[PDB]
Amino acid sequence: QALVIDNGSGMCKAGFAGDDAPRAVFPSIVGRPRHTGVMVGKDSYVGDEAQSKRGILTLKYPIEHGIVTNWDDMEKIWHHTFYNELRVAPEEHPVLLTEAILNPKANREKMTQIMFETFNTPAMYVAIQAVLSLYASGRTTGIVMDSGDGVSHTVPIYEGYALPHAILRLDLAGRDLTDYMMKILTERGYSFTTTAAAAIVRDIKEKLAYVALDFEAEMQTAASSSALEKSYELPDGQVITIGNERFRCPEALFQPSFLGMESAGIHETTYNSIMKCDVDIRKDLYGNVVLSGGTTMFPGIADRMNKELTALAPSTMKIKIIAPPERKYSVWIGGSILASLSTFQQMWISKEEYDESGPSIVHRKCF
Amino acid sequence: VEHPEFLKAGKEPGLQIWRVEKFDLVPVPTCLYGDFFTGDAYVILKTVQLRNGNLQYDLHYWLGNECSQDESGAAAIFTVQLDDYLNGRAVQHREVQGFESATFLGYFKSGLKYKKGGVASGF
Numbered sequence: 001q002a003l004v005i006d007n008g009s010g011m012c013k014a015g016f017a018g019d020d021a022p023r024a025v026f027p028s029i030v031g032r033p034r035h036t037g038v039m040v041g042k043d044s045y046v047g048d049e050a051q052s053k054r055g056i057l058t059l060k061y062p063i064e065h066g067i068v069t070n071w072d073d074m075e076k077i078w079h080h081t082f083y084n085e086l087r088v089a090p091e092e093h094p095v096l097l098t099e100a101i102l103n104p105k106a107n108r109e110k111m112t113q114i115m116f117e118t119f120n121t122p123a124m125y126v127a128i129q130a131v132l133s134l135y136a137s138g139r140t141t142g143i144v145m146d147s148g149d150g151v152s153h154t155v156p157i158y159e160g161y162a163l164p165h166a167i168l169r170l171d172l173a174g175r176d177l178t179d180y181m182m183k184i185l186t187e188r189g190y191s192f193t194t195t196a197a198a199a200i201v202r203d204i205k206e207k208l209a210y211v212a213l214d215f216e217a218e219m220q221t222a223a224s225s226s227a228l229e230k231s232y233e234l235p236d237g238q239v240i241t242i243g244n245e246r247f248r249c250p251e252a253l254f255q256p257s258f259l260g261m262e263s264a265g266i267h268e269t270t271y272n273s274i275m276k277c278d279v280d281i282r283k284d285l286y287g288n289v290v291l292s293g294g295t296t297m298f299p300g301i302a303d304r305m306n307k308e309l310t311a312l313a314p315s316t317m318k319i320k321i322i323a324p325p326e327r328k329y330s331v332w333i334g335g336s337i338l339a340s341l342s343t344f345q346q347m348w349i350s351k352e353e354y355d356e357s358g359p360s361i362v363h364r365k366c367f
Numbered sequence: 368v369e370h371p372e373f374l375k376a377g378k379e380p381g382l383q384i385w386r387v388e389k390f391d392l393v394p395v396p397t398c399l400y401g402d403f404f405t406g407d408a409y410v411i412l413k414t415v416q417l418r419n420g421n422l423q424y425d426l427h428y429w430l431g432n433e434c435s436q437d438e439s440g441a442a443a444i445f446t447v448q449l450d451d452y453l454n455g456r457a458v459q460h461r462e463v464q465g466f467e468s469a470t471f472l473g474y475f476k477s478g479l480k481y482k483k484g485g486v487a488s489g490f
């Protein structure tokens with residue numbers, strides 16, 4: 001029984017290889033006391049419980065833009081995952097973990113070390129998240145557009161392996177979108193003032209936002225009619241109306257200038273990655289643009305990516321955008337499938353190999 | 368990979384066909400070659416001997432319209448693994464039911480057949 005853990009900036013996804021969906025999805029947050037020693041309960045809380053008790057904790061995210069920045073806190077996340085979420089003893093299970101593209105060498109080693117030395121895993125494997133999403137989509141070649149909470153990436157992959165030179169990174173993702181939505185609703189005339197403000201605005205974004213096919217035309221419709229407006233009930237029971245904010249918020253993926261960024265949008269980043277690849281494979285990248293992650297979850301996003309890439313590529317290029325409804329957990333599902341393969345027991349780093357080679361074994365086994 | 372079916376792959380010119388069955392690669396009886404379950408996923412290795420005698424490898428994973436995500440995922444991954452096992456010498460081809468390449472359709476002298484059903488998901 002292998003375990004699959006997909007660690008993200010915002011959310012940890014965890015479960016059992018062979019399941020078709022994560023068993024546990026929780027915020028990637030470690031809470032520690034503001035004042036030590038004076039009250040019952042150094043000391044820590046993880047996930048939803050940390051969020052609940054946030055008024056008396058200092059909350060931290062161990063993962064920033066997909067990369068681990070606090071190993072002490074990451075360890076708390078894994079301990080909670082094993083013991084509280086999956087309810088397993090980690091020494092009893094092979095563990096598949098996931099990593100960002102271009103994950104620094106020292107980080108891959110530290111993760112391996114923590115698994116074998118702290119958690120006594122009998123076996124582990126680290127897989128690249130985008131490659132996992134591609135496999136989940138039943139493809140070995142394509143370009144993955146991964147957008148989560150802290151980071152977006154375009155990742156071309158050919159015959160099973162990412163092309164590192166062609167990879168592009170956009171530091172604009174879901175957190176930026178939630179903030180932008182807060183900003184533009186505030187300007188409309190609303191005021192999100194309670195402690196639940198970030199979650200209310202995030203929920204409005206997740207429930208009511210969409211990507212406009214033609215942005216200027218939607219702005220028009222929205223200005224001239226009330227056809228696009230939706231009501232949203234606040235926790236207190238107040239009902240507010242969400243107008244053009246529904247599509248203006250995710251528009252910032254296509255127009256990072258909305259956010260004060262000079263960078264290219266997601267359609268252009270995708271195109272730029274494709275153009276860094278050998279001309280002979282481009283047609284297969286355009287024909288296999290896989291969307292993956294929570295921030296790809298907006299309705300209309302695929303149609304807009306198709307439209308934008310169509311305008312960027314020669315007119316005879318076949319463009320296919322692949323955006324399955326379950327794409328929020330594509331990485332996890334690809335891991336589940338990989339970890340279930342009759343061939344997976346020969347892929348993993350065993351405790352025995354770790355003992356003989358130490359943490360640098362990961363570079364030789366996992367790529 | 369130590370996959371027992373890998374040890375057999377690509378030894379002589381010809382066609383070899385495996386079905387994904389519950390996260391494993393299972394060879395298809397040679398007398399069934401060309402009848403595909405639309406609810407299943409398959410890995411097809413075509414070995415061609417050039418005029419030199421040198422072996423050339425094309426690797427197709429075929430996806431039934433109703434195959435479950437574990438089957439199409441495993442077919443893709445098994446394809447990469449077999450390619451790696453073959454020192455990277457296979458050219459990989461995604462084949463979708465109803466949209467196969469002429470090259471792939473050409474492997475079946477009396478034309479491939481589709482039939483409904485198949486082996487249950489490994490999930």
Ligand SMILES: Nc1ncnc2c1ncn2[C@@H]1O[C@H](COP(=O)(O)OP(=O)(O)OP(=O)(O)O)[C@@H](O)[C@H]1O
Nearest residue numbers: 008009010011066148149150151174293294295297
């Ligand atoms: N239906 C939805 N529509 C739009 N955004 C969504 C939806 N569901 C979730 N999100 C957003 O997706 C983000 C979390 O997605 P995901 O779990 O893929 O991120 P992560 O893996 O934690 O982050 P990263 O990949 O950046 O390290 C959050 O910003 C969340 O608000």
Ligand SMILES: [Ca+2]
Nearest residue numbers: 007008009148
């Ligand atoms: Ca992620």
Ligand SMILES: [Ca+2]
Nearest residue numbers: 406407485486
């Ligand atoms: Ca099947």
Ligand SMILES: [Ca+2]
Nearest residue numbers: 450455456457
């Ligand atoms: Ca190859």
